[PDB]
Design a protein around this ligand. Structure first.
Ligand code: CLA
Ligand code: CLA
Ligand code: CLA
Ligand code: CLA
Ligand code: CLA
Ligand code: CLA
Ligand code: CLA
Ligand code: CLA
Ligand SMILES: CC1=C(C#C/C(C)=C/C=C/C(C)=C/C=C/C=C(C)/C=C/C=C(\C)C#CC2=C(C)C[C@@H](O)CC2(C)C)C(C)(C)C[C@H](O)C1
Ligand SMILES: CC1=C(C#C/C(C)=C/C=C\C(C)=C\C=C/C=C(C)/C=C/C=C(\C)C#CC2=C(C)C[C@@H](O)CC2(C)C)C(C)(C)C[C@H](O)C1
Ligand SMILES: CCCCCCCCCCCCO[C@H]1O[C@H](CO)[C@@H](O[C@H]2O[C@H](CO)[C@@H](O)[C@H](O)[C@H]2O)[C@H](O)[C@H]1O
Lengths: 172, 175, 189
């Protein structure tokens, strides 16, 4: 039995097709040492944060909130331009959200990523639930790569992604 | 008959679907579900039939609320942005409700529904089967024809900067 | 419930393409079927019901004060506020309290007493959210004893409905102010 992402390697033992984003990809064998469900929860959380982050590196170039209209369109400048009060409120809100994740991860036995947030019940249909389960992890990994790119490009150019693209500032 | 006689017949094209002359040289039906391909073909063709009609009508008729551009392609850039967003979200609502909130290739045909049949037949029009088959053939053929026609009309309107019938008369050439 | 299965309760579906959550039960006064966004899954149900009732009762007092303050003003309010009403009044009261005027302290008195009542009635929330014998909205406040029997049931329905109606009304009466000024009866006529 061989891995399906890397066809010349044996299939990793502790990752199965029941996991939503499975492709048989573990060449360094992380699943052989660490707790696989912990890595699933962590991958889902890193991906969700990067989905929000990849949207938010781009969105102030389209438009800003009217109270933040004087704030820079470079994300690494607008990070500082927000005062400590606004970042403290953001941190408090994230902490309130992560209290549920703390309870579920350290004291519960739910599925990885399951914080009970399905108000529209879009996982009621089984085939739709399978597609959404794979697609969340897929877009999360894509947003992880994309935000990594956007951050290091914003370090290099001191401007947002759309602005660097349309100015064609592609060389350091 | 086969559209390409020097290649072998595509195995997934059995001739049941209307418009099948055996034309899949790349072999798209060998990789993807034929229902998804037919739904995409009908959607592209229907949007293009409406687009051809719009390019022909917006050349002459402009509603008094809006202020006409020089070309029906330039007509897009003179609409208020909120109106375009309203049209986009209304089309999104139609796409959500017509598919039963099953918008992906993993769940669109989970209930065994027919490709391109969204249950939109208001004015009778669907009781004779012998007329239904011929109108399936006409719909798919006019959809493909309007796809190529819409591509031509939009690219020619972008190039010349004049309308479609405005280019059919007083035709100038690239020099 | 009052006309259970007809006016409220079992069977009723408000939005046919967006069913309410099956976690949302069918024995709460005011259940018609209407939770298309599934927002009852994101919070405690006791907190949601009591929050709806409190928002509604505050809105009821707000509409019946918003009309009456257009009709009747208490003696001497003209000396402090003058010709202002609704969203202005609050502000200038505080402005008077910011100015130094020792007689414009109405909103500070009401924030004091309403905050004291809310602080003292917090354990009712805490016991209701622990499955206690108190239902959301029940403070056992019936001085005249009028809802002492089955008549309560009807009243419960009407309460939540009027609450919801009041909840809409204030919003109009506020935003209709913020464009033009004036007031509800000055804006109607
Ligand atoms: C519920 C039904 C409904 C209602 C009440 C409206 C109301 C309106 N439409 Mg409209 N529309 C609808 C359905 C509706 N639409 C549908 C179903 C379609 C697609 C077939 C359209 C397509 C459409 C176009 C193409 C345009 C409008 C425009 C307008 C606005 C004209 C006034 C104006 O320019 O000042 C408003 C001026 C502003 C600067 C404010 C921005 C506009 C706000 C956002 C409108 C809010 C509408 C609200 C969300 C209801 C829309 C529902 C949505 C599902 C479409 C007006 C507010 C025009 C417009 O937006 O011009 C700007 C316009 O060009 N509509
Ligand atoms: C990793 C996430 C992340 C982080 C850290 C930031 C950080 C920041 N953003 Mg940003 N943003 C994000 C995502 C993020 N954003 C996304 C996803 C969007 C698209 C909506 C935006 C759109 C946006 C705008 C338009 C602006 C900022 C601005 C800012 C700065 C000030 C804080 C602020 O007002 O935030 C605002 C951020 C939000 C309102 C995003 C909240 C996203 C929530 C948590 C998701 C809600 C989930 C769900 C849909 C809720 C409904 C469920 C219901 C239907 C049941 C700060 C640097 C401001 C700035 O300084 O620009 C120069 C500004 O004007 N952001
Ligand atoms: C519970 C409701 C509530 C209330 C009353 C406030 C009140 C306030 N927020 Mg706020 N906020 C809230 C929820 C709330 N927040 C939530 C849920 C978030 C999501 C993370 C934020 C995110 C937020 C940001 C990002 C900022 C504020 C800011 C402010 C302040 C406005 C500016 C000012 O007075 O100085 C004000 C104290 C601003 C502030 O403090 O300016 C420095 C500001 O920048 N808030
Ligand atoms: C979604 C992915 C994505 C996209 C589309 C971009 C797009 C861009 N990046 Mg960026 N980047 C990304 C992710 C991405 N980045 C990530 C994850 C990082 C690491 C944090 C970076 C770090 C980065 C830096 C440091 C710089 C860019 C720069 C650029 C710009 C020019 C790149 C170019 O033409 O020369 C770059 C192309 C090459 C050097 C050729 C690569 C040759 C190798 C052999 C191919 C590797 C491809 C890939 C890894 C697949 C591997 C194959 C597999 C079998 C293993 C362009 C806008 C430049 C820029 O904006 O300058 C102002 C720049 O200096 N990027
Ligand atoms: C329904 C299909 C259709 C039709 C009838 C036309 C018709 C026309 N196109 Mg057109 N076009 C089409 C589809 C079509 N197009 C498509 C799908 C595209 C790509 C998006 C274009 C892109 C396009 C461009 C870019 C241009 C035209 C031009 C023209 C005009 C001159 C014809 C010419 O020079 O061709 C030459 C014809 C031949 C060499 C005949 C070969 C056929 C042999 C005999 C078959 C065997 C003519 C009115 C030109 C124009 O408007 O001039 C200003 C022009 O510049 N077309
Ligand atoms: C949401 C509730 C609310 C709020 C915030 C206000 C706020 C205001 N009112 Mg107003 N008012 C209200 C309801 C409200 N009113 C109601 C329900 C009425 C009677 C129909 C009035 C009649 C009224 C008059 C006649 C006047 C004001 C005035 C004012 C202003 C000065 C403060 C003052 O002296 O109030 C006075 C308010 C009252 C005397 C009404 C309090 C009656 C309470 C609500 C009865 C509660 C009974 C209930 C059994 C208690 C249950 C408690 C608990 C068990 C839940 C201020 C802007 C004055 C002003 O500035 O005019 C512009 C003024 O002249 N109000
Ligand atoms: C319960 C409601 C109520 C009642 C019965 C009265 C009744 C009265 N007020 Mg009064 N007042 C009220 C609420 C009320 N007020 C409110 C909510 C305010 C604003 C905080 C005022 C502010 C006020 C002032 C500033 C004055 C009065 C005065 C008076 C008295 C004479 C009227 C006059 O000269 O003008 C009268 C007994 C006057 C006075 O002192 O006469 C004794 C006076 O100068 N009132
Ligand atoms: C106007 C609509 C309305 C209706 C139909 C009700 C109906 C009810 N309320 Mg209620 N309530 C309302 C407004 C309303 N309330 C408002 C605005 C407040 C805030 C001041 C309250 C505060 C309140 C408390 C604190 C309690 C109730 C309780 C009750 C229930 C017992 C019967 C009762 O108290 O007689 C209701 C009295 C009337 C409907 C008379 C209204 C007077 C006239 C007709 C209105 C115009 C002046 C009953 C379901 C009690 C309960 O559930 O447990 C027994 C309870 O503890 N209510
Ligand atoms: C939970 C669920 C729902 C909720 C929900 C939420 C709101 C879901 C919405 C989610 C959004 C935030 C998903 C975002 C994905 C972003 C990534 C994939 C794009 C990455 C871009 C990369 C590829 C790139 C970039 C590139 C960079 C590097 C360099 C540039 O030169 C080029 C380029 C720009 C191309 C709802 C409310 C419906 C209810 C339901 O009951 C429950
Ligand atoms: C049409 C429709 C439906 C519906 C519906 C819906 C969606 C109803 C929507 C209602 C809306 C949009 C209400 C919005 C706001 C109301 C508020 C905040 C009320 C009061 C505000 C106040 C007092 C304030 C204030 C202030 C004060 C005092 C102090 C000041 O210093 C500041 C400030 C000015 C802020 C249904 C459900 C039947 C379905 C149907 O198929 C379609
Ligand atoms: C999503 C994760 C949430 C956690 C993020 C919270 C981080 C909070 C820190 C940033 C808040 C503001 O803090 C910051 O503000 C000043 C400007 O406003 C910064 O001041 C300076 O910042 C940078 C250098 O330090 C420079 O690029 C700025 O031009 C300069 O203004 C200070 O370095 C710091 O005090």
């Amino acid at each position: 039995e061989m891995s399906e992402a890397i066809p010349f390697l044996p299939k990793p033992a502790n990752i199965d097709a029941s996991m939503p984003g499975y492709s048989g990809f573990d060449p360094l064998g992380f699943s052989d040492y660490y707790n696989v469900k912990w890595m699933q929860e962590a991958e889902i959380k890193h991906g969700r944060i990067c989905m929000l982050a990849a949207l938010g590196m781009m969105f102030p170039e389209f438009g800003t909130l009217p109270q933040f209209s004087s704030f820079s369109t470079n994300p690494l400048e607008a990070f500082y331009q927000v005062g400590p009060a606004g970042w403290g409120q953001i941190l408090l809100f994230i902490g309130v959200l992560e209290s549920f994740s703390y309870e579920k991860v350290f004291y519960g036995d739910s599925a990885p990523g399951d914080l009970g947030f399905d108000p529209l019940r879009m996982s009621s249909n089984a085939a739709s639930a399978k597609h959404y389960a794979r697609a969340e992890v897929m877009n999360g990994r894509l947003a992880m790569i994309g935000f990594s790119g956007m951050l290091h490009h914003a370090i290099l150019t001191k401007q947002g992604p759309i602005t660097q693209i349309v100015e064609q500032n592609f060389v350091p | 008959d086969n559209a390409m006689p020097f290649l072998e017949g595509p195995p997934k094209l059995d001739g049941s679907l209307a418009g099948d002359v055996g034309f899949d040289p790349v072999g798209f039906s060998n990789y993807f579900d034929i229902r998804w391909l037919r739904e995409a073909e009908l959607k592209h063709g229907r949007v293009c039939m409406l687009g051809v009609t719009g390019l022909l009508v917006q050349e002459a008729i402009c509603l008094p609320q809006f202020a006409n551009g020089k070309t029906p392609v330039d007509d897009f850039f003179v609409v208020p942005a909120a109106g375009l967003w309203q049209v986009f979200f209304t089309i999104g609502a139609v796409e959500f409700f017509s598919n039963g909130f099953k918008l992906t290739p993993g769940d669109m045909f989970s209930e065994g529904r027919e490709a391109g049949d969204l249950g939109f037949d208001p004015l009778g029009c669907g009781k004779n089967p012998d007329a239904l088959a011929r109108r399936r053939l006409v719909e798919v053929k006019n959809g493909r024809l309007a796809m190529i026609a819409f591509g031509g009309m939009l690219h020619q309107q972008l190039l010349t900067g004049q309308g479609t019938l405005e280019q059919l008369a007083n035709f100038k050439a690239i020099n | 419930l009052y006309k259970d299965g007809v006016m409220q309760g079992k069977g009723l579906v408000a939005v046919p393409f967006a069913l309410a959550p099956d976690s949302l039960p069918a024995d709460i006064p005011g259940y018609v079927g209407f939770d298309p966004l599934g927002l009852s899954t994101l919070c405690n149900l006791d907190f949601l019901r009591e929050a709806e009732i409190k928002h509604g009762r505050v809105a009821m007092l707000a509409v019946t004060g918003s009309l009456v303050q257009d009709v009747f003003q208490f003696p001497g309010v003209d000396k402090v506020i003058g010709n202002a009403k609704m969203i202005g009044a609050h502000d200038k009261f505080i402005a008077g309290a910011h100015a130094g005027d020792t007689r414009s302290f109405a909103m500070h008195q009401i924030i004091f007493w309403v905050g004291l009542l809310e602080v003292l009635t917090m354990p009712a929330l805490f016991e209701t959210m622990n499955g206690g014998p108190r239902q959301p909205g029940d403070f056992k406040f019936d001085p005249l004893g009028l809802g002492k029997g089955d008549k309560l049931a009807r009243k419960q329905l009407t309460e939540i409905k009027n609450g919801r109606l009041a909840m809409i009304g204030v919003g109009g009466m506020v935003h209709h102010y913020l464009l033009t000024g004036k007031g509800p009866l000055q804006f109607l006529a």
